[PDB]
């Protein structure tokens, strides 16, 4: 991956201006798209530890879901190696992207109730924040336009960022390098696990059982508590797989293809996509 990304064929829209930075969305429209359509939309947030990464990461998945009739887009957002930001600022940007899509739904040919948030690792954390973590919104935006996505598709997300009240040991990962200094809030306020509650949008999660960066057990524990609150939260283990297994180009694109087929199935299940 490179940054800045190259996104051939995508329509570029600035979704947020903050600190003289123009944050872009890269939009892939389906065949036969028209503004009066009411399609489902999916917004991908790249991974990179809230420090690096590129919107090109989910370019293959954008093209797949646009081919299936969705308005698919990859959002840029601020990251620590490029901008003086902390995790909470990344959350603000992710929420700004969902709110912008909803706000512009009529010009995008999108149903404002069928907006899917998706991402990998830190970007999966951001997607989860847009469905369940309160607040952390851009202070000057219209908060009467909801920034909450209507579903989520998460690729080995980070979902626990605090260890308080939390169950048993959680090992020391070098990416928690006292990143508490680069969270920008008290850790619970950016930790999806600590905002589990009834009435949340449905999601599906793909995670490798041999993930040594984000322990699978944190995700299993998250999914169990979400189910207990009545939420549809499907965790699909990829047996023996490592962090990042799902990316285009990893393996023989087998996990890549499988996650797309399962994500597709999930979107047909919840009514956001017609069968093939």
Strand ranges in the chain using DSSP code E only, listed in sequence order: 11-18, 21-28, 39-45, 71-75, 110-120, 151-155, 203-208, 233-238
Nearest alpha-carbon partner for 127 in 200, 71, 185: 200
Q: Are 77 and 45 in contact (CB under 8 A)?
A: yes
CA 74, CA 239: separation in Å to the nearest integer?
Answer: 28
- Angle at Cα 25 formed by Cα 58 and Cα 149, nearest 5°? 80
The Cα–Cα gap between 80 and 48 comes to 10
Number of residues assigned to the chain: 276
| Dihedral sign (CA 43, 49, 53, 57) | negative
What is the maximum alpha-carbon separation in the chain? 52
- The answer to whether 193 and 226 have CB atoms below 8 angstroms apart is no
Resolution in angstrom units: 1.6
CB 122 within 8 A of CB 158: yes
CA gap 161, 133 in Å, rounded? 12
Hey, is 155 helix, strand or coil?
A: strand
Give whole-number Cα distances, 27 to 56, 72, 238, in Å: 12, 6, 30
Closest CA to 42 of 276, 198, 266, 275: 266
Question: Which domains, and CATH codes, for the chain?
Answer: 11-270 (3.40.50.1820)
Say how far apart CA 61 and CA 260 lie, in whole Å.
8
137 and 94 Cβ atoms separated by less than 8 Å: no
Q: Phi/psi of residue 174, each to 5°?
A: -65, -15
Q: Are 214 and 119 in contact (CB under 8 A)?
A: no
For 112-140, b/e burial (b = at least 16 CB within 10 A) is bebbbbbbbbbbbbbbbbbbbbeebebee
Alpha-carbon torsion (86, 148, 129, 46), positive or negative? negative
């Amino acid at each position: 991956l490179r940054y800045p990304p190259e996104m051939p064929g995508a329509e570029v829209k600035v979704y947020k201006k903050v600190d003289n930075v123009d944050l872009k969305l890269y939009i892939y429209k389906p065949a036969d798209w028209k503004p009066a359509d009411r399609r489902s939309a999916i917004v991908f947030f790249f991974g990179g530890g809230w420090q690096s990464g590129s919107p090109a990461q989910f370019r293959p998945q954008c093209e797949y879901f646009a081919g299936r009739g969705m308005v698919a887009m990859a959002a840029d957002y601020r990251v620590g190696s490029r901008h003086n930001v902390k995790v909470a600022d990344c959350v603000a940007d992710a929420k700004s992207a969902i709110r912008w899509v909803r706000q512009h739904a009529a010009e995008l040919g999108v149903d404002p109730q069928k907006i899917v948030a998706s991402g990998g690792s830190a970007g999966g954390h951001l997607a989860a924040c847009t469905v369940m973590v309160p607040d952390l919104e851009a202070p000057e935006e219209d908060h009467t336009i909801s920034s909450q996505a209507n579903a989520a598709i998460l690729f080995n997300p980070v979902l626990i960022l605090s260890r308080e009240g939390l169950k048993d040991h959680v090992p020391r990962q070098d990416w928690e390098e006292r990143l508490r200094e680069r969270l920008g809030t008290e850790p619970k306020a950016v930790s999806p696990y600590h905002h589990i509650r009834a009435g949340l949008p449905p999601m599906i999660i793909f995670h490798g059982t041999a993930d040594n960066t984000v322990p699978f057990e944190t995700i299993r524990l998250f999914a169990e508590a979400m189910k207990k609150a009545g939420n549809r939260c499907e965790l699909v283990p990829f047996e023996g797989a490592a962090h990042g297994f799902f990316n285009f180009g990893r393996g023989d694109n087998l996990a890549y293809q499988k996650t797309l087929e399962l994500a597709d199935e999930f979107l047909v299940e919840i009514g956001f996509l017609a069968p093939k």
